Design a protein around this ligand. Structure first.
Ligand SMILES: O=P(O)(O)OC[C@H]1O[C@](O)(COP(=O)(O)O)[C@@H](O)[C@@H]1O
Ligand SMILES: O=P(O)(O)OC[C@H]1O[C@](O)(COP(=O)(O)O)[C@@H](O)[C@@H]1O
Ligand SMILES: [Mg+2]
Ligand SMILES: [Mg+2]
Ligand SMILES: [Mg+2]
Lengths: 518, 518, 518
């Protein structure tokens, strides 16, 4: 048996687990989008091509580092790699570009005569933190400059301060004027320009600084597809990001990175304001106790699934693959369970940005996601997504759930959907069919943005518009058929579901046909 | 808040029951078919016209009584009453004609007119039973004739003989070559030609007698829509009726009447052989202990529902309405519960054949069914019907379950289906939408046979066949749209689901559209 | 709200996830067993006392390395540490000792001279594998010795050979009688005595070698509690381990390590023969594809849960904590998901055997387990465990399921169970209450082995048997009460469930009492 067919049919979740079978191969199609952070290890056109071949759907540019020039040259490379495959439109893969905001980071200064090395702090040793910009590049084991000028208002005597992915912790002992004396609660090698966290501090930095607006305006000029907004704390932060993109940026997706207590606490208003969510587990597990992160992850994934908005699970998914050709058993399990929880995308960071095995990392994500997608208990998931979704009068929403139901009923090879803006296809994605959603569009950005949604295999029609609209609709369906055939999603005799609108509109999807693939 | 909608959203059946509301009005549409037995109280064109106006769908002719000439006239009156409404294609109701077989009945003879009226059978009195035809019409307290010639072979001293809906019982005290001396165990008033039951005696009467053959052939000739075959004990019994119905009877639905121990015991084969089932409770409740009838009733309804085959609940649903303009509380509950169990149609016998309130009984059935249909727990029923149904490759099957799903999602006004044979619509009905299924057909037989399925409101198109097939389709669609508007099923506000096919075949339904009503 | 109680009351698993709350504190009790591998980092009496305080339940001795003398000292220290708390019976924790077998391992030899230390294998380089004992302690980048004398009988040209947690890979270019020539495909640096894997080779080493025989007998004289048997392929393997243990080691629990393809395939036979299972992910994810491991883990946990037999999740759970004081986000997730899957115990290897932060690794496991236990969807799990158990039994199984039900109904502080051999506490565990199960016993081996079962907090009663049974019962019950109170599991006003035999006996635990705590 294939596709965990035996397990799919169990009357209990327990029995479903018992029936999971190592020797049952998955379907060819992989549903979960893969986002990769591009940096010095993956920036070259040639490796970028392999990455796309290995499965990369979205290139993330981390604006916490680098320069406009650097990132512009990265974007150009992504676009050369991507376009190198346009000669064959049946096999061309759209690739989205995402701008990841710096936001309200606190960084440390430079280490003495930098970067001549690093320092060592020791448990019990004491440290003065100064705001005095004299020490800006004079940081050693005795004094450390930070760039957050209001730090003294916000912390108190006993406050913990984490430095560098939270591996070092200090505790404020002597407070003071515009400086802090602390005892190293937890020591280690301290380098230059490291991140600082102040869990439970009322930190007043904005989500959107002047420098964030300049980055965002750059993203609009660079025609990126999406924005990952860092440290969003309330809806009004999301609205600032969107408004500031202006009319030219109107269709860029806003993804809120939830990465602090207030973000989780205000999750619902943030979700309502956003196009989607990223569970930014890195900062999230320093900001709140690490034992609690999986709770926040499952919470957010549930709510985004319940709302039909994309959710990305991020950070350290395969961390050890920075240095090694295989992941840890923890990492393999982490990716799989993110898929099983319901994440639309999984993300790689250091493992593609800077590691020695970017290509192996991407493949691993692809390989795990597709085993995990077969392992999903669709029986319970579909039922629960139905129950929990409201009665509406939008005919697209009605056609979408109807098509997903039909697809389960006939076990079809795909759901094919024509879409101008993405929406019809996103509506189908919401109900989590097992079959891949082939979204045919002419809008290239629609194609790129479709990767945010579980299940949507976007396809960019290049053919000119027919003047008989009915014939144009057909050209597109047949196009989707050739792609599925060429990719192995289905064969000549199989059946598929095709969603179509009644007029050439723009939001009129309302027709579902069950057809054999020619 | 209308149609038990608060109840419909409950997560448990118990909470659903708690939320049932006496002030929440149902939809206009009524989904359960009403079968009325036609005889002396209901036979004239005038009263037949009121019966249709009242919700009658099927006219049953019971061939345990009358001559062919009598029945020909009844059918002709039904047709006249039905056709009287043809002058307005929108408000016309097809009416089906059903032929109910005598089968292997045992009955007593005629009481001596004197004119005593009825004979008084007294507990402990002796009563001779004879087979001598000279006594056929000379029945009284001392001598009772019976038309089952073998009776003496199949009972023994001490056997029990039941007479008249099982109200009178006799014990065999003495056995003879062509007579029986019995003692009255259960006394009462005995009238003429009463039903006799011998539970657990080994009755050897053929399933299809010469008289039945005659009646079946006349039904073919007369072009009846369906036959209710009495005392079906096994699949081969059904085969005889089908044989005897032959090619000209190709399309007559055979409905097997389950009314003895064997019929229940062999139920699965009879169900696979038949086009439908009738739970024939009158005899059933004499052939098995009466406290067990509800168990038989609910297993047959359950299995027919699981098989997607029409089942009919019959007999004493509103018995007391034979004499009274309003039913007993047990009668109102009985009708409601039959619908609630999933019966496709409910039936009236004496209440329309001979009663003083034929029209009130029909109205009462229409009123209770519509109330009960609003109280069904569809969340659970729809979920269980899906689980239990197999994955097929039949595009029409996929389409049907997709349309029902869409119908719940947008609270649809109706599911409009174009069908020639009826199948496409039968396939929607087996998934039990709440919304009426308006089947548009040009085939008149198909429109009459549709009444056998819960929720199909057949509609007969009379319009000329347009030149262009796509415009002919659209015409049938606009037809159904007008009829639902005319009758208050829905307004320009609403949405309806339209099912359609890709070619003027004859089994190619593969298209569902979700459409705001123009 | 506490304890994710709001999430507990959800109608769907999806809504359950939606309600998972970062600010909802868990209970004090932690149910999942913690197994720690003792090694150079953890072996001192002083470190071991802190491990017990931080949460260690089972000390694991890995007989893949070390001499018997070494292990006997580790064992003696574990007992010195454990017994140093026996002076307060209220706070004493039984600590089990487990022996983890070497089994049919394949290892490389020692590097160097002259090496020095590591040796860099280069992608594309050629490496000769030899079997000549002259090279046993002379390995380098050209020449590698292995201790598997039949390797040559059993790989082929183009077979893959993996070295050191599958991080280095070699392809066989040329075979030969007692050597192999190979090409490095995944390079890296190769240390001494690394594990070798031949996936898809029929490796023919015995289940129980002479060394294993000697190790198991040593296990018997040291009085260990359990044996983790490596590389169990089939039931006769478990039977061989049982024969060595013999009559004298009768009560020692055998936990079969599933770590190769044949073990997964013959899982059901192995589980029937075993006392529990370890999912040994390290070797397993090299033997089968790493993407597949999560599937095997979940199938094994499900089937062990359904059988009521202990299951352990092992290997790389908090790996990065060997060198760092906080785990990665993948690591935190992996631990939570293992507990959410249904695992009875979790395990630490290098992180407590050799790393810089053994105490923090224990604490973290303790913290996550307890967080994950509050997040379980008990409403579904209990329903499923009851449905998959037989409606048969056996008053003892009925009482235990009745106890677990009462325990939810009143948010019991604990279920107190009196047991000689553990069995009755085992029975309660298999139904997965959320409340801790305080198992009171006078048998010290029973108390130590109890840690194999989720939720069983063993408590060793040292008082002599009282003159009246009823006072003997109350003594032990009251002792459970005091331990619960001292540990913060519950207080004076709370209710606990107490399970007991009817007669002074042992098993036949058929009595349940719901009692307030004094
Ligand atoms: O998903 P969206 O943006 O609503 O677009 C769906 C639209 O695409 C179509 O199928 C085709 O329209 P175009 O030919 O204008 O692209 C419409 O019938 C439908 O309204
Ligand atoms: O339910 P049935 O008998 O299969 O008929 C459904 C058929 O009716 C149609 O919708 C219309 O066909 P006609 O124009 O032949 O009536 C077909 O496309 C479809 O196959
Ligand atoms: Mg950033
Ligand atoms: Mg009859
Ligand atoms: Mg070992």
């Amino acid at each position: 048996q294939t596709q965990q067919l035996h397990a799919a049919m169990a009357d209990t979740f327990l029995e479903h687990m018992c029936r999971l079978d190592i020797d049952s191969p998955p379907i060819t199609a992989r549903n979960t989008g893969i986002i990769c952070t591009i940096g010095p290890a993956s920036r070259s056109v040639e490796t970028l091509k392999e990455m796309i071949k290995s499965g990369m759907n979205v290139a993330r540019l981390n604006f916490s580092h680098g320069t406009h020039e650097y990132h512009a040259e990265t974007i150009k490379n992504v676009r050369t790699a991507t376009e190198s495959f346009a000669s064959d439109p049946i096999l061309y893969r759209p690739v989205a570009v995402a701008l990841d905001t710096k936001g309200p980071e606190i960084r440390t200064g430079l280490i003495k005569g930098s970067g001549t090395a690093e320092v060592e702090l020791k448990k019990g040793a004491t440290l003065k933190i100064t705001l005095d910009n004299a020490y800006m590049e004079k940081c050693d084991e005795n004094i450390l400059w930070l760039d957050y000028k209001n730090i003294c208002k916000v912390v108190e005597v006993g406050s913990k301060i984490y430095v560098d992915d939270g591996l070092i912790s200090l505790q404020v002992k002597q407070k003071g004027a515009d400086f802090l004396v602390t005892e190293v609660e937890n020591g280690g090698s301290l380098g230059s320009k490291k991140g600082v966290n102040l869990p439970g501090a009322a930190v007043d930095l904005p989500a959107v600084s002047e420098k964030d607006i300049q980055d965002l305006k750059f993203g609009v000029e660079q025609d990126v597809d999406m924005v990952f907004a860092s440290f969003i704390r309330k809806a009004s932060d999301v609205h600032e990001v969107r408004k500031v993109l202006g009319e030219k940026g109107k269709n860029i997706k806003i993804i809120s990175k939830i990465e602090n207590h207030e973000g989780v606490r205000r999750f619902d208003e943030i979700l309502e304001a956003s196009d989607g969510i990223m569970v930014a587990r890195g900062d999230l597990g320093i900001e709140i106790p690490a034992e609690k992160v999986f709770l926040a992850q499952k919470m957010m994934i549930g709510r985004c699934n319940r709302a039909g908005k994309p959710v990305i699970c991020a950070t350290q998914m395969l961390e050890s693959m920075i240095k090694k050709p295989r992941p840890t058993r923890a990492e393999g399990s982490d990716v799989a369970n993110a898929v099983l929880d319901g994440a639309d995308c999984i993300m790689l960071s250091g493992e593609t940005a800077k590691g020695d095995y970017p290509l192996e990392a991407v493949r691993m994500q692809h390989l795990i996601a597709r085993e995990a997608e077969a392992a999903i208990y669709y029986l319970q998931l579909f039922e629960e997504l139905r129950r929990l979704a409201p009665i509406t009068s939008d005919p697209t929403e009605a056609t979408a759930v109807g098509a997903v139901e039909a697809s389960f009923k006939c076990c079809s090879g795909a759901i094919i959907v024509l879409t101008k803006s993405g929406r019809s296809a996103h509506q189908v994605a919401r109900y989590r069919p097992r079959a891949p959603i082939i979204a045919v569009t002419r809008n290239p950005q629609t194609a790129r943005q479709a990767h945010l949604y579980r299940g949507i295999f976007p396809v960019l029609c290049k053919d000119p518009v027919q003047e008989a609209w009915a014939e144009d609709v057909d050209l597109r369906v047949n196009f989707a058929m050739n792609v599925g055939k060429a990719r192995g999603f289905f064969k000549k005799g199989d059946v598929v579901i095709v969603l179509t609108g009644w007029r050439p509109g723009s939001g009129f999807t309302n027709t579902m046909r069950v057809v054999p693939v020619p």
